[PDB]
């Protein structure tokens, strides 16, 4: 359906978008991006060091409960 000129323009525009994104990726890194990475590290800390120790203390209680039986 599309004409040859439309296809050529689509190719060239996709190429321009990719080239522009590459040139943006080659731009100097600001302090805001580093702050974003620092906040990513900060969020990860809270996500990993979250308390999930009930899944251990419940078992220890159960071990004792059944150890009393044994």
């Amino acid at each position, epitope marked *: 359906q599309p004409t040859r000129y439309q296809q050529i323009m689509k190719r060239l525009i996709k190429r321009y978008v990719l080239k522009a994104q590459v040139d943006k990726e080659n731009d100097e890194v600001n302090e805001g991006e580093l702050k974003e990475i620092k906040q990513d590290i900060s969020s990860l800390r809270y996500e990993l*060091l*979250e*308390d999930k*120790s*009930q899944a*251990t*203390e419940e078992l*220890a209680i159960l071990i*004792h409960k059944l150890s009393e039986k044994l």
Partner: nanobody
Amino acid sequence: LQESGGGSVQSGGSLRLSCAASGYTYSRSCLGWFRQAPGKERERVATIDSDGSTSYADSVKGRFTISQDNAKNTLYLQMNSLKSEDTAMYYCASKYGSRCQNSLGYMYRGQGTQVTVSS
């Protein structure tokens, strides 16, 4: 540190405890109160994390409230509707990490407070 608030109260009343335990913010510390009932074994009453998140035992859910001062230098336990079950030598403990809701690793380091409930 010395646990305070020791005394006797009638069943269904209220009482307050205090422990000179230094909490930390940003530093992943755990504070909590523990119950050593005579005849029974030591158990966990309530714990408070560095972020202020509190975990209560199923027995004391909704009835107790673990808190601390703004400077997180003193541990406060508030008890409401103290039934006959809630009778023990309420010690005070402090460990490191996010393993607040696991009673292993706590360093009690205290004389303990004696509380009894009359029926």
